[PDB]
Every structure is written in C-alpha cells, then in structure tokens.
C-alpha cells in the first residue's frame, strides 16, 4: 500500500462535503480552552464544515488573516491539561481519565473534544497531541484486544500472557467470565451471559483473555468515549477513515515529522547487544536507507507513536517514567521482530545478514505482529 495515496483520497472526500463562505472563531491565549469550547459549540456541524477564520484579538505576532494552524496547535496542548479533569497525562499521550465525573459537564466537554479532533482531520490541520494505539483503533471501528493492553497496562498483559502460554487445567486455576464493578461496595459484572458460573478452560482461555483485555481497556471511560464520538461523527463520519490503520491515522492527525538519525543513535541503549554488534550496525544502515515515511512507522512500531518530545530521544518517555529507545537480543534467525511500547524496547533476533533484517523488519512494521 501507499499512505500518500490514502491521504490524497481522504482529502478529496472532505472537499466534496465542505461548505461555502466561512465562520468567525474568536479566542484568547489566557482562557483558550473555555473560549474554544464556547465558540465551537455555538456553531452547528454544517457551519464548522465552512472555512475556519480564527483570530486571537490583542495578540502581537498574529494577524486577522487565518490563524487556525496556531489555534489547532495551541488548543491541542491545553486539551491535555489535567485541571479540566478530562485526560490523565505525563509531565513535560491522551488517556481518558475515568474520574472525569469530577467535572459535572465533562460529557459536554468530551463532545467538544470530539468535534475538535474531527475538525482537525476535515480541515487538514495538524494537532500536537495524540491518543493511545487502541484509541485510534476505536476511531477506526477496529477490534481491540490483548496486543493493545501492553501499552496501557503491561503487568495485566503479562499476567494474561502467562494464562495464554501456560496450562490452567493442569495448574487447576479458579477463573470465571466475570469481573469486579463498583459506587457503594463492589459487585460482579459478567463478561459473557451467565459468565460468573462459567469456569475458564483451555477451550475458552483465548475468549476469556480477549473479553478481559477488552474490559480493562474501557472499564470506566464508556460514557466519555460515547460522548467523544457524538461530537466526532457529527463533523466527520467515522466511515470516511475505514481504509486507514492506527499508525496512518496518527500521522494524518499529527502530520509528518523529520526524524533526526543522529539524536536517535546517540540516545539509544542496548540490551544484551553492543554499539559495535553486527545486527545493531545493520539496523542503523536500515534506518539510514528507508525514507522518513518508513522511519516514522519503525518509530511507531517500537515506541507506539511517531511524535517526539521537544528535547529529543534523551527525554523519551515510557509507561514507568523515562525510558530510552532499547534494542534487545531475543530469539533466533527464524523469529520475526517484536516490540514493547511500554518500555520502547525492540526485540531484535540475531540475524545472519542485512537483507534478512531488511526483509524481516520492513515486513514487521508494515504487516505488524499477530
């Protein structure tokens, strides 16, 4: 496939659904989030499909021509601010905070964030914020599972992988198709009908691992997600993004970024490998050979995102705080390469040649792991 062809097709569809003339959006830097909220909601969906003439009155360095790119950039930063109680963030990705009920109008704000993200896609403006890999699959109406749980909760994922790879019937483990749910006291919640009295066995352990992973990834953010998509679909229907994947949609929203190969290799750690290891040297020869379009996909495959901090690869973050890009020696030449986005760790097997690495990695970043 070709992402340039898919983006060009999607841009043509938006131009057909676009409306004539324009609308005025007046905001300020001090109260940007609330101004933007009031403004975007004051308009109708058909009005938000017209040209967005945005202004920042009394802001030196901006003019009364178009200022939508600075609005979409700056507003995307303030969306992540935890004071609004909508998203939980790491200091200096967007994960919907399950305690957003604190803000009584949180569902009204999630509809606005839904419209905001659908407006960035429609009008072809980039944002400097992004959601998790599973959340992009939610936008694309793609099925979510155990693979996507590793990014949000690695130790739950690791406990489920033990159940998948080890024999539960021999170990004789008591597990049912049911999970805990609270607000006063706590009560059981079935995963499948009458799940509570259905013991997990070898025949249905894969079904159980799926249904628990699916639950954990959306346990307390259902209404919030439902509110986000009310706002999303009334601007841009999700059907228009069906031919994209979670990695293409991220670049369609956040735009292309030139990755610095020098800053990448300088702030890269190695597990059971050296800087002078035959496979590590073939990896940087591969990164230098591929086009920036594939370098972003390789970065996404290992870290879970094409986006980088303003600092660089030294300030790269994981799930358990700061974690630099790692390349681990794992398996044999017969294996396919794997990744751990929680720790930004690439499991690179010890291949015998460069062409085997180029064929195995280029295929693993395009076809993904399954």
């Amino acid at each position: 496939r070709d992402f340039k062809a898919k983006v060009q097709y999607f841009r043509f569809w938006c131009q057909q659904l676009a409306m004539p003339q324009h609308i005025k959006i007046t905001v300020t830097r001090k109260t940007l989030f609330e101004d933007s909220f009031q403004q975007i909601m004051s308009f109708s969906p058909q009005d938000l499909r017209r040209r967005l003439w945005v202004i920042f009155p009394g802001e030196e360095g901006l003019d009364y021509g178009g200022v939508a790119r600075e609005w979409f950039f700056l507003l995307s930063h303030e969306v992540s601010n935890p004071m609004y109680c909508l998203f939980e963030y790491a200091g200096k990705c967007l994960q919907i905070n399950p305690a957003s009920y604190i803000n009584p109008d949180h569902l009204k704000y999630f509809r606005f964030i839904g419209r905001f993200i659908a407006m960035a896609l429609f009008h072809g403006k980039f944002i400097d914020t992004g959601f998790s890999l599973p959340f992009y699959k939610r936008i694309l109406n793609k099925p979510v599972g155990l693979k996507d749980l590793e990014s949000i909760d690695p130790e739950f994922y690791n406990s489920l992988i033990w159940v998948k790879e080890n024999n539960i019937e021999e170990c004789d483990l008591e597990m049912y198709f049911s999970v805990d749910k609270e607000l006063g006291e706590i009560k059981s919640h079935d995963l499948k009908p009458n799940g509570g009295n259905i013991l997990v066995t070898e025949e249905n352990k894969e079904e159980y691992i799926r249904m628990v992973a699916e639950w954990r990834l959306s346990r307390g953010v259902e209404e919030q997600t439902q509110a986000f998509f009310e706002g999303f679909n009334e601007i841009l229907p999700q059907q228009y993004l069906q031919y994209f994947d979670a990695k293409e949609l991220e670049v369609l929203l956040c735009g292309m970024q030139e990755i610095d190969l020098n800053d990448w290799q300088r702030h890269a750690i190695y597990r059971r490998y050296a800087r002078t290891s035959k496979q590590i040297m073939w990896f940087w020869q591969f990164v230098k050979e591929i086009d920036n379009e594939k370098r972003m996909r390789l970065l996404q495959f290992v870290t879970g995102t094409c986006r980088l901090p303003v600092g660089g690869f030294a300030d790269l973050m994981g799930s358990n705080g700061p974690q630099k890009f790692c390349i681990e020696k794992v398996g044999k030449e017969n294996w396919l390469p794997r990744s751990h986005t929680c720790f930004n760790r690439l499991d690179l097997p010890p291949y015998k040649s460069y062409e085997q690495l180029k064929e195995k990695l280029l295929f693993a970043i395009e076809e993904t792991e399954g």
């Binding site: 033990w162 159940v163 080890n166 483990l173 597990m175 999970v179 805990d180 628990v212 346990r219």
Partner: protein, 71 residues
C-alpha cells in the same frame, strides 16, 4: 516497600513487605488480609511464575504489581 497485589477480576490488596521477604512469606501475609490458603495461592511477577521460597529481591521495587491466581 508498599507493593500492590492484584487479580484478573480487578481487586487490589496493598500489602507492606521488605525486600528480604520470600514468596512463601508474601503469600502467608495475604492470608491476614484476604483469607486464602497459601497452597491455593499462585503469585507471579512479570510474565514468569513466582516460586515459593525465593526472596523478592531476586525477581525485583516500591509500588509494584504482583498478580494473584487462585486454585
């Protein structure tokens, strides 16, 4: 070090334990809070199963997630 003891149902159990404490001693400490026999308990750190007798410093820190599977 205060570490969390979780399950696949969603329950959590904050238990205070020193790094010198073993998996047999950690499972025995869970009996005082949950009330499950240590033989029915099956703990695991990371992707690997925890063996009764080995110290917690071998598997390796503060605010960690140990998943418990009942038998």
């Amino acid at each position: 070090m205060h570490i969390l003891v979780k399950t696949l149902r969603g329950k959590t159990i904050t238990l205070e334990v020193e790094p010198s404490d073993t998996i047999e001693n950690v499972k025995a400490k869970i009996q005082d809070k949950e009330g499950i026999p240590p033989d029915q308990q099956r703990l695991l750190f990371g992707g690997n199963k925890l063996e009764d007798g080995r110290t917690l410093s071998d598997y390796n820190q503060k605010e960690s997630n140990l998943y418990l599977l009942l038998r």
